[PDB]
Amino acid sequence: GTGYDLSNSVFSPDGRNFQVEYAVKAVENGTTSIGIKCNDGVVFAVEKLITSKLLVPQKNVKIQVVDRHIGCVYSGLIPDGRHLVNRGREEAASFKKLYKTPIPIPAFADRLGQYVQAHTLYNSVRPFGVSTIFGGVDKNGAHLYMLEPSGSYWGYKGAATGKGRQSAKAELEKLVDHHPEGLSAREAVKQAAKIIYLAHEDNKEKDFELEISWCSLSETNGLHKFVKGDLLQEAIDFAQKEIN
Amino acid sequence: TDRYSFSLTTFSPSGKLGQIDYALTAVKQGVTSLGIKATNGVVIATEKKSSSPLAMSETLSKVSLLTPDIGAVYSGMGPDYRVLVDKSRKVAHTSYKRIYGEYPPTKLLVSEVAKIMQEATQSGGVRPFGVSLLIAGHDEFNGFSLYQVDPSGSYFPWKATAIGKGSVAAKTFLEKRWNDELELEDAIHIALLTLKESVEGEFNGDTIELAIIGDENPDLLGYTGIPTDKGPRFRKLTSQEINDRLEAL
Amino acid sequence: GYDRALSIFSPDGHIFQVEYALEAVKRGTCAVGVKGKNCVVLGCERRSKLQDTRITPSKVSKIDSHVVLSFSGLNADSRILIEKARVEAQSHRLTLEDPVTVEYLTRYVAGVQQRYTQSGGVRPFGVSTLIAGFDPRDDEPKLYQTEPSGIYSSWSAQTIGRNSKTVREFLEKNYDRKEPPATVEECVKLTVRSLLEVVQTGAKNIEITVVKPDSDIVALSSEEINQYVTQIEQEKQEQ
Amino acid sequence: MDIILGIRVQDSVILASSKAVTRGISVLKDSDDKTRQLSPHTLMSFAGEAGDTVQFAEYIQANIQLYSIREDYELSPQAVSSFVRQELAKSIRSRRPYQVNVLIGGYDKKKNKPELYQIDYLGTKVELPYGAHGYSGFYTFSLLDHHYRPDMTTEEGLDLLKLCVQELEKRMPMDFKGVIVKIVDKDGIRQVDDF
Amino acid sequence: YDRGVSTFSPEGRLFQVEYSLEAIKLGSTAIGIATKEGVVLGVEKRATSPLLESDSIEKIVEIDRHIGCAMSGLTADARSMIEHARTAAVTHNLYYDEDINVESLTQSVCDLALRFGEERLMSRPFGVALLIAGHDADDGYQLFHAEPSGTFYRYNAKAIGSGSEGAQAELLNEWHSSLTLKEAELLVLKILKQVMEEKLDENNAQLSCITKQDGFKIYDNEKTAELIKELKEKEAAES
Amino acid sequence: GYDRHITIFSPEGRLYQVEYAFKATNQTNINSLAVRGKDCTVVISQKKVPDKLLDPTTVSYIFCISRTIGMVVNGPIPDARNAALRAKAEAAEFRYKYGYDMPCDVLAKRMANLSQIYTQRAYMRPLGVILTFVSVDEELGPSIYKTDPAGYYVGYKATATGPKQQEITTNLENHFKKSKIDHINEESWEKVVEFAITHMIDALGTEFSKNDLEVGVATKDKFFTLSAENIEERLVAIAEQD
Amino acid sequence: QFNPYGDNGGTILGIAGEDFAVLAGDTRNITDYSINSRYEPKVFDCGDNIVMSANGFAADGDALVKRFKNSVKWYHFDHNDKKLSINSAARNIQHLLYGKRFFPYYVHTII
Amino acid sequence: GSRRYDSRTTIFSPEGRLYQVEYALESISHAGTAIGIMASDGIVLAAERKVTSTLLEQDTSTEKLYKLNDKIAVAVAGLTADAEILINTARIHAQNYLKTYNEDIPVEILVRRLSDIKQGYTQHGGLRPFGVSFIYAGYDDRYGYQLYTSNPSGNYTGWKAISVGANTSAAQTLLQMDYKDDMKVDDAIELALKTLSKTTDSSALTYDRLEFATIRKGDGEVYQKIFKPQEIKDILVKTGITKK
Amino acid sequence: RNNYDGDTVTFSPTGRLFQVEYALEAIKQGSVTVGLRSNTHAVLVALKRNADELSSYQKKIIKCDEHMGLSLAGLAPDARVLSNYLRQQCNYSSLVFNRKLAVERAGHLLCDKAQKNTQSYGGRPYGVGLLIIGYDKSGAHLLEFQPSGNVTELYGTAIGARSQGAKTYLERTLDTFIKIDGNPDELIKAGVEAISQSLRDESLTVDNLSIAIVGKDTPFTIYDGEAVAKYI
What we know:
The structure is cut from a larger assembly and holds nine protein chains of nine kinds. Chain D has helices spanning 52-71, 77-92, 135-147, 154-171; strands at residues 4-9, 12-18, 21-22, 27-29, 35-39, 42-48, 100-108, 113-119, 125-127, 130-133, 179-185, 188-192. Chain D has a single domain (1-195), classed as Glutamine Phosphoribosylpyrophosphate, subunit 1, domain 1 (4-Layer Sandwich). Chain D has a five-stranded antiparallel sheet with strand order 10-1-2-11-12, covered by helices on one side. In chain D, strands 5-6-7-8-9 form a five-stranded antiparallel sheet, with helices on one face. By secondary structure, chain D is α+β, with helices and mostly antiparallel strands. Chain F has helices at 16-25, 77-98, 104-120, 165-179, 189-204, 228-240; strands spanning 32-36, 40-46, 62-64, 70-74, 130-137, 141-147, 153-156, 158-161, 213-219, 222-225. By secondary structure, chain F is of the alpha+beta class. In chain F, strand 9 (213-219) and strand 10 (222-225) form a beta hairpin. Chain F has a five-stranded antiparallel sheet. In chain F, strands 3-4-5-6-7 form a five-stranded antiparallel sheet. Chain F is globular, with a radius of gyration of 18 Å. Chain G contains two helices and seven strands, in the order ββββββααβ. By secondary structure, chain G is α+β, with helices and mostly antiparallel strands. Chain G is globular. The longest helix of chain G is centred in the middle third of the chain and has 21 residues, at 58-78. The interface between B and H is large, with 44 and 38 residues.
């Protein structure tokens, strides 16, 4: 037979759901976004394409916050990412209302995964066109997770998605192999700036603005905060030195 | 959202209902299960075909008690039979016992299951059941009875009948060996002889599942004190009894 | 639950379901209505045996003591339309303390059909209707036609059903607006002639119902229709 | 304080309904007709709470006329009384019960027999040779028990109803401003002009 | 049936909207001219048979005492729109003790046009276009064209229906800002006679006017015949 | 052609979507066996961490449904987590409504009935996963019950699921034909874990490190999962075995 | 039992002139025998040259004034910034009040 | 989404017919033939069993003739389960009428109710129609004895003698040949048996392959008798179709 | 491609949503409208399009609150729906929090409103693009909203037919118009020049030009008709 890719949640004879893979293709066409789990926390970084200099710099924020300790970035259909972030915010609000404590990172990951998986269960709904790198600090330490359009999520030492995902992943593997002891918070921020600058090579036609946030127990008291001011310029300078 | 509010079973230009015939085809490919009505009870037997020998044979019950006087066996898709048995056990209470204080008769429970299956063949976004049922029951005012229920929602009373793969051949045997003067033991013997041809592997009490609607078992009531409440008429034959009846063939 | 848009627009600007309902109307029995000077006459065709004419439902149905409705097409949908019209007539009697006008009832049935053409999960009515009667305190006859599309219009004489084009042309050639049929007999005669132009079977397949002001509805027996057909066939002997 | 009387006299049913509608200390109307013609051979008089009476009567009338139009057949007085009793028995266990009592008088053409049914707001239906709703019964029933004969004529029934109305005007503490009297028989429903 | 009712075209259009526009193109002609002395609306009573009483061809309706409406296309679909418009007008009068603005009424009517799909909405868009004429104290006399696309425009003059295209051309050539009421009536009658497939008489053409003094009035056949005779005299006095 | 897209009967009386979900169960290329002891139940599954950037502690196909029931899933991890959440919710609801812990077979039958629902309803797709519940029921002893996307559920003396399912099944069948018993006659659960790992080594013909296996042990009123160090200690004891 | 209403005192007064109008109110807000506030205005400008004051239960009066100001805002939104005539505002306030016919605003209104 | 699989059961054909209605009629055309005859003093229903076998218990069997109340019976042609659903609704409607008016429901009212149900199933809801044709045999004190017929389209008509199911053409021809208005109930029995024996597809017309019922006046009330297999065999050997 | 433009619920083999792209194309066939901003003001210029000489020029700029407004390009009813949603959100903010709705949050809420249609079966994407100007506690803001859901904050932009010319004009004149502080008339004239740069065989008249201005000490005001003559 044929036509198995025309409706969502339809199993093909090879045991696949082609709509999920098409959503993954839509994700791969998006900008690069990375996450690095260090010793005391996590760092998220993203590349924003400056199609024109009419875009107001430092605006059009792509990294979103859930609760006060969860950071989420996504590659793909930005509106689907915002939808997923709103769903996660509702889940975290209900979790705090019921169990008092802020929601743990694995719990939030499972909530988002169940949501996306349910979105891959019916032909009346379209799969999410985003890959989401999220994480933060809870009572069990730092956690970093990546969640695919299939609803499949995993915990990562380092994660990356987008056009430059290949290069970024290679660089992250280098960071994992060279530093088994672990990176610090600001060191991870500078390395994320470097990795984003290296990943931009797959979309060199346009210029890019780097956006970095971090959630670390030592530098931010376990809260997700945007890397701004002097540290952002320091990371940009480190990346520009690592390039040339 | 469940947007399948339309019928998945529609009349073809020839007048056939495709899904009904396809469920019947699924039934024909199922393991053979037969039933024989005697003058002092009814017998229902089937083959307990196990996929892997590592599987527990007792955990694969093809005969299910519906009421203490009504049991059922099937041929077709196991899970559909299981959910139908659950629905039947529930409707036996919500539609009769909780209204009349007594369990339903055989014809009424069979008609309720047939109504369930007919709804499954006309409601929105649902396929028919891929099972044919043989329900054997006894009530005080109609005696013993055996009914066959098809995926179409139709049910027929049978003196004896088989359903499944070699059912046709099995039916011929019944037609040659059935008489209106049969005893429950004679019916069990005829059922064993009929099932012996429909099977090819081992033919023992662990490969056959047989049950009877016969006399009341006061020893199976669990309590003694009310002489009016007799025991249950449904009884599943143990493997030892099946082998003891097989050794004398 | 089921809300699929069955009646939609086509690239050429057509609603195919409404046109197919009109086609179903074209397959239905014939039904003509003629306005007199003081009466209305509804004639209907009873197709082709072994039928109990005592208990079988007639095409002409009473909506209220003063207004009647005949139809052409699927009888099963016509029953639903007639019941809705009767219920709305009783409700209007209850709320307005005045029986429905022929135009109000016609407009209600037409609105129901239009809703069925525009609602989701439902098909249009395969029924075209002829509503005839007199206003509660008016002697002027009223004859309206409604279509599956929801259009309703007044008519001095109009037919629907099978071979309705021939009957409509015969009426256009034999109905004079300057002088309508003065007596009830003239209107009934014109109706039965217009029917015999298509039925070609006799009075056995012709039903006649005459409505007259102040709620005087009379259904002619087979004997009166036989009198009419014999009179017109005797007048036909001229050559 | 409404007078609703009825009497069955071999050939017809006679229904009498008070003409007075009083809201407070003011007689607003003295010519009110407390009956509704459900069918050409079935009339219904009503009494009870303000507004509920006419609403219930006209609703029942619309339903009976709808049945007559749909089936081209006049319902027997027994079936009409059963339908009214069902509606009133559903009213009591509703949100706002209809506080209406009805007297249904009808000539069954099938049996060629006059019938009188009395139903209260609760759904208590009884077939009676003579019936009365409210305190009027406390004066009429025994009186009828003494003067009623099953073989009475419509004129004798009118005289008996006149006697009942005279006793009511004498002993009742309220001026119901007379009674409207109606006769239901095989020839339909007619009204007595001066009573 | 292979796409949804709320499906965009590769050109960026709604299929059902354009199909409903094509359907309206097959409808009767409805022309409107807005001046400083009032707004005139003229429609064609397209009769399919001489037996149809042309008085029952109601293609010009009154929304409110100061707002009138003309319909073109599937006129059955316009019944719900006209009812919604009348209820909106009277409800605005009830809430604010004043007359609803013509633009506000047109917008309220258009809010229903795109309320379709598969909260239970309609199955298809409307198959009728509307010309809504009115007078309010803010913008004076106004004429609005309302499509089933939910979009509405304001026109100094607008023609819809069969042969409206070329009609619009003539409406561009003969309309000026200082045009009067009688001139608008004569122009509507002339364009209707041009775009009609029959001889223009008071039985196949209907006129109506919205004036600040007398509100919305539909002209009786006498005034229409007088204006037709005047138009014939004027056109006969040319070269 | 539409009969192969939704859960309706084909002209041959088959449901192709169910068969394709069965096919999708093997998408992960992970095999898992389950065996019963004297008073415990062991499940072993393959732990494949292909990416270096992955956290190995988060890569798991075994789930602690309740304090007594564990479940190992063969199939994609989205549907696996869906079934795990549903099973945990069902166990909690059972304990609340009926006042005693949900039996293994009862949870298996519930999940199989939900699978049958997905098989007969066309609005939702079957979950392309095979679920193996294991427990030590207070009335049944060590219990292994498996359910599949078709709605079937059945108990086992031992079982296996995956691409190499037939080989492991045959190995277990041969061992139980030799021993002439229906379980592993060993008192300690550590030796039963060792036995299961050893027979998986024999069936698959490949060696395993401590980071290549997932072990779930169910004893009376406690289901747990072994850490990498306990798995490595069992592997050392298996290497000492001759 | 919870009483949903309260008394906040105060007094307002409206007088219409030839080409002007005046709406005045005391700026005293009280509860029982205590002074809540010595300056709490209760006569508000609602736009379109219309002043409004609902005196009585301060919560219901504030809610009514807010709903009427939102009403004039949406009247401008839905009618191309048409000026709200005083009669139109009066009827709109009648409908706003009768909306709670069975749970009224415990206020006396003057515009 | 889901519209791809919707067959649209309640749509018209370009000719002006309902596809599912015509196909359900074609389905009923393969069902066992049923015949109703209304004589001067009774009504007779006779039908042939399609499901026929030596092992079929015919005593407790009911597949063609059903009771609606004490004065109305139905002969079914088509899907037995849909027939039983409609018969249950008809019994409930009859008892509702009885509770409301304290009178037995007239035959035409019940027929119109059931036919309106079958019609509504063919106009909205998107469900397949009931593949069942009904022959109603009833008595009431308004029209006397009544014979009606209804099809899945929702239409119902009154008859003196009528047939549904298979071979309706030959059966109707034989009925029109041998029917007379002044005939009695026994003559109608004879005619129904002869028509079934001449229009059957089986070899011979035996008792075990037929269902029979008679609504007659014999006291002062009407009695509704569903024939037992022995009574069918006796009436067959009396008419001469069989011998003993 | 062929079998992937049936609804918003179907992804293409390359990962595209063709119904969203068809809504974008519906925008591209709409009349042009430009928006720009400085540090004190924000201007929206709108080229209203007519059908004929007798027709009106459809209003393109919609006011959402005294500090926020938008201009449309595309389907007018979808723009009305989104503007009503924005008015309701601003009103909710002002009533519940006594807080003027920021422009960023309004853009986020319109992003959510647009995304809620591009994932559920039934319905369609919005067929309009919006240019939202506002002045809040953060200063002046200009946002471009597409039916894909992506809302971007810009100094200047233009949407509709031939909008690339105006976009390049603002690109060249950025350093000039970003510094037009305190003088709204110069910003309005710059926007008018920008919209003139996108007129192929067209000319600005007194009936076809629409202006909108909002900024410091300047509520969102619309200028139509004679009021725009000074800028033509």
